[PDB]
Amino acid sequence: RRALLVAGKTKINLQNCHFITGINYNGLTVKQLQELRGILRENSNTKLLVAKNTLVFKALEGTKWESLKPCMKGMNAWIFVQTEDIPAALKTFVSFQKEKKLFDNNLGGAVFEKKLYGPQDYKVIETMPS
Amino acid sequence: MLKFLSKVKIEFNTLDPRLASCVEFLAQCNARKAKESNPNCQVLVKRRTDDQPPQISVTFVNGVEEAFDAAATSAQSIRKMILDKGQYLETEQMFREAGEQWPVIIPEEEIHQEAPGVKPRK
Amino acid sequence: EAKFFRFLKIVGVGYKARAEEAGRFLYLKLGYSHEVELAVPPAVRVFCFKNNVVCCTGIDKDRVHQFAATVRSCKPPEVYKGKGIMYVDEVVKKKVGK
Amino acid sequence: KSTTVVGANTLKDRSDPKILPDSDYPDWLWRLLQIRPALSELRRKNVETLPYDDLKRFVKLDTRAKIKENNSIKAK
Amino acid sequence: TRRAVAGTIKLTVLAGKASPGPPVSPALGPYRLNMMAFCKDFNARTQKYKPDTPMAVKITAYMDHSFEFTFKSPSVSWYIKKAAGVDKGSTRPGHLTVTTLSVRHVYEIAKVKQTDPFCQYMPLESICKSIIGTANSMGIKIVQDLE
């Protein structure tokens, strides 16, 4: 029944999703975590969701978001970008690391147009605008 | 956790499906409890694009370096043998600091010698 | 080669520990009129350091652990001030002496 | 007696605000008093044909019920 | 920054009148905490408001005798028993109703209770239902409109 929640939450999360990534949420306080979730929802259009690794992928199986399966280890927060404006969605977390000084919490792996880009790779996609 | 170590250098390819031990070790050693036991320690992360296997290579306080097979062993196993080797190096230390020769050595035939029970006497 | 180690702590004013002959004999001062002498068994050796700390080494785990238990049983820790012989990592829970 | 909110505003320049007419108010404000579904209703329904918010309320209420049950059996 | 938090104490002081002895006495004297800089920084903050506002402060005590405290606007209990009626809650709440309030005072307090430093992303419906919960805790009755 608690998996039905995660199935529904990611079903609503993937209705307009263009981009899935992860954030290592080691050491983040509850106030910091809620602040990042709120920053991502008004300055951008992206919904953040902490869930099991095994549930999210099972709701990403037989789907467009199918090959992410290796990058589903560790304490992860899933950042379903439901807009098209990927550059602002990636810039606001860079602003978050710069302002709040949290360099242990990084963006690990992403899926865009069914391609798993490394964090080396989806940085020029933050550099380019529209 | 960090009371025998002076550098935790962890490197892994980000995409490879055996990153679980490395990222879990990063979870263990970057904790609030861990860095209040050794603020002088260094935790180094090297994210790389090539396909070397994940490798946790720690070095201890007395310069001893002992690498690990990160792609094949869990982070709790890494932590357990780090605790064992660090305790052994600490035992060897106050041994050398007090004038005792290290390692302490005994002949390997006193096991077959009979040992009567130790009765404390005046 | 001695693989197994167990470390004892001596707590108390005037309490002392002293090894004599290459680790084959241990002598304790536990507030009595005499010293308490323990003959260290074969494949076990004993050392004393500058923290009032006893060390028990050897190649047999059973004999080393048992000898450390014997040394602790010479003067087990008392509950009111923590004096006596205890393991280094042992936690003693005190109570209020009225 | 029902024209201003008493002591709401605390700024020294400002004063207590006034109750606006029912056009400046949001639509949810007169839906606050409704009876949200309870745990007895949701436990006797079908879980798969529940809405999303009804499922969310069901899981939080079941977690609260079981946590209070644990506290009750573990209490003394 | 790096300090292991020694303690965290909450504290109630009326607005601007922080003379450190009756409320700011043993409360900060128990944990070695300094009084002068805390009081000057507090009264340098709650000067914009009317005096005698029972404002609540959470002090994050430390080991280097340093302060990073957060000042919070007063409780919704005071906001509801000042904007509704008597200053005495029920003896048996939910059995003995004391004062009744409709929805609009609740809406205005929810507008006030969003201005806290850590509630920027909380929505007003959430705070409104929370205020109905606090009202039900006190015996205060809630209605649609009083006439």
| DSSP secondary structure letters along E31-55 | TT--SHHHHHHHHTTTTSB-SS-EE
Tell me whether residues A2 and D59 touch, CB distance under 8 A: yes
What tokens appear for D20 in the block?
A: 């606006």
CA distance A123 to B12: 19
Q: Who among B24, B31, B47 is closest to A119 (CB)?
A: B47
Amino acid at E140: I
CA distance E94 to E135: 10
User: Under a CB-based contact definition with an 8 Å cutoff, are residues C34 and C94 in contact?
Assistant: no
Touch D-B: 3+ C-beta pairs under 8 A: no
- Cα angle A82, A84, A86 (rounded to 5 degrees) comes to 95
- Residue B7 is inside which H or E element, if any? strand B5-13
Please classify residue B101 by burial: count the beta carbons closer than 10 Å to its beta carbon, then call 0-12 exposed, 13-18 middle and 19+ buried: exposed
Residue among C62, C18, C40 nearest B118 (CA): C40
Q: Residues of B with CB below 8 A from A104's CB?
A: 26, 30
Which single residue is written with the structure tokens 């954030």? A23
Amino acid at B45: V
Distances (CA, A) of B31 to A102, B4, B22, E11: 13, 16, 15, 30
All chains having 3 or more CB pairs closer than 8 angstroms to chain E: A, D
**Distance spanning both ends of chain D, measured CA to CA:** 49
- Cα angle E13, E19, E24 (rounded to 5 degrees) comes to 55
Which single residue is written with the structure tokens 């201005």? E115
Strand partners, B68: B56
Query: For the sheet containing C84-87, what is the strand order?
Result: C44-48, C53-58, C4-11, C84-87
- Cα angle D17, D22, D23 (rounded to 5 degrees) comes to 100
Q: What is the CA radius of gyration of chain A?
A: 14
DSSP, collapsed to helix, strand or coil, labels residue B98 as coil
Query: For the sheet containing E70-72, what is the strand order?
Result: E7-14, E54-61, E70-72
CA distance C52 to C18: 9
E66 HSE (CA, 13 A, CB side): 8
Query: Is some CB atom of chain C closer than 8 A to the CB atom of B15?
Result: no
Q: Who among C58, C59, C74 is closest to B120 (CB)?
A: C74
Across E56-94, b (16+ Cβ under 10 Å) vs e yields ebebebbeeeeeebebbbbebbbbbbbbbeeeebbeeee
User: Which H, E and C letters describe chain A, residue by residue?
Assistant: CHHHHHHHHHHHHCCCCCEEEEEECCCCCHHHHHHHHHHHHHCCCEEEEECCHHHHCCCCCCCCCCCCHHHCCCCEEEEEECCCCHHHHHHHHHHHHHHHCCCCCCEEEEEECCEEECCCCCCHHHHCCC
Q: Who among D11, D19, D33 is closest to E49 (CB)?
A: D11
